[PDB]
């Protein structure tokens, strides 16, 4: 469970143990199923929804360390580098699950199924419409977000990349960790995008991490609205800022997307200089010089609680999806 | 000298020593090691020497001095040696480009082509309006102050309008800038004289040359910005910022960016720096890269002949 249980750990089969004896390995798939198997932060109890998000993200590693100490005692040993990489993966996966349930509750409201009240969040004021449904896509590592686009838009990028290569120029690259896109019209009556998950069980982990495959080749460029980069400890400042401008140049510029925004989530920013740096206007918006300009990175967001993450994403959808007819 | 001399070190006053108390006095190190030697413009052995050994010579000479004068307890951290080596890497390379510009400017005003050492004579049509100045910029320097006041008013109005809507002006801080010599300075001989070495007056002359051109450079007269170096995207981003502000908002014909390094950590840096300039793609009019090259100078002579080739090609547009 979210709180460590000796009886639940004892009932775990060897394939379910959060610590895999090989040196020892942190089985993050079992860590999420053990800690968040019945708890989606922000959509659970009031104590968990209002808990410090750093303690919520750090709970699976703390539960795994307790299990390894129980079974192996002083033999159990993991490096700080291993505990850091897993915590960063959990920070991204858990936050993506919160946004997934936000989209599910949002999509339910858009199709006319009302506003779920447990837990209590402010009902969006935007007029409901099935065409305003969204999909939260946790993108794998080194994933080409161009593959999300419809074939006629991939050909524009492919011809543009080929022409630049003939002049010795490279197509600027960009790899966000997550993308929020308008739900394709052919999927606006599929109930899977409206169902909130009760916890990060193994089937639900596969559902969320693989949802990007369902939308490959089906997204219009203008339907991409938000990209997210997860840095558990933002030391490493200019790659997201550069890649945010790259996405806006290719989507808003070469593909005519109305607005493509970018934000960085972090748990411990190293100073306040990163907030000033991320106030910079989008380089493409300044280059076009015609339409209204927004920042390359809309916010350096430090989630205090999981409920604030859900509230903030609900407010984003209520304001951003108004631009969709 | 470039080669350590016990006799020369003994003649130095205590204030002229490379080791002070330990601290690496880089101004004394450059005057000791390169007081009579500008790499690429000195002996053939130094011009063709491995550039890492040339940049690493002042630190080695300073360590030798500290060893000879503080045998029992001399010690300098590897981080302190790395910081001074990085500063010497910028200053020495900036001095090479200074003498390149001086020999270039001498040719532009019709004084012929100096032949010692031998470099390929530019095929460009000489013209005093094609002279250039090499400006080593201080840390956190606002290069917009180089621009004429009318152009500064455009940037400040641009930043004020952005700040009114909660937007920040994108920042960029190159280490060095190559600009066309202002027309009021195109007959002053200081820009045509090659320095014989990095003596203390010549160090001040090169480090303070930017103050002579503040408020006097037209935006289109900026041609090349240089940065001396997991930390890969800040120069790439600031390169696009300079091109956006100069080529875009100020109408500069071409502003190129350069990153010089003595040791690239990996190989993905060269592939990453092949990216086209973001502004050039947005304008859609002859697009060039954001960073024209990730340059690893093998020798000081290669630094000189590469900068000569850039000027011969770039200054034809003027
Ligand atoms: Ca991802
Ligand atoms: Ca500098």
Residue numbers in the entry:
A (entry chain A): 2 to 23, 34 to 246, 249 to 338
B (entry chain B): 2 to 22, 35 to 242, 248 to 303, 305 to 337
Sentences from the paper on this structure:
For the filament-forming sequence-specific DNA endonuclease SgrAI, the process of filamentation both accelerates its DNA cleavage activity and expands its DNA sequence specificity, thus allowing for many additional DNA sequences to be rapidly cleaved. Under basal conditions, SgrAI is a homodimeric and sequence-specific restriction endonuclease of 74 kDa with two active sites, one in each subunit. Each active site cleaves bound duplex DNA containing any one of 17 different 8 bp recognition sites. Three of these sites, known as primary sequences or primary sites, have the pattern CRCCGGYG (where R = A or G and Y = C or T) and can be cleaved by SgrAI in the absence of filamentation.
Second, we present an X-ray crystal structure of DNA-free (apo) SgrAI resolved to 2.0 Å resolution, which reveals a disordered loop involved in DNA recognition. To our surprise, we instead captured DNA-free SgrAI, without bound DNA. Two copies of the chain were found per asymmetric unit arranged with twofold symmetry to produce a complete SgrAI dimer in its apo form, which we refer to as SgrAIapo/DCA. The structure of SgrAIapo/DCA also contains a divalent metal ion. A single Ca2+ is found bound to each subunit near the active site, in the site designated as site D (see also Fig. S3B for the orientation of site D relative to sites A and B in SgrAISP/FCA). The Ca2+ bound to DNA-free SgrAI, SgrAIapo/DCA, is coordinated by six oxygen atoms arranged in an octahedral geometry, which are contributed by the side chains of Glu103 and Asn149, the main-chain carbonyl oxygens of Leu150 and Asp188, and two water molecules, respectively. The role of this divalent cation-binding site is not clear, although its occupancy in the DNA-free structures suggests it may serve as a reservoir for Mg2+ prior to DNA binding, because Mg2+ in sites A and B bridge the protein–DNA interface. Residues Asp22–Gln34 within a loop region are disordered in the absence of DNA.
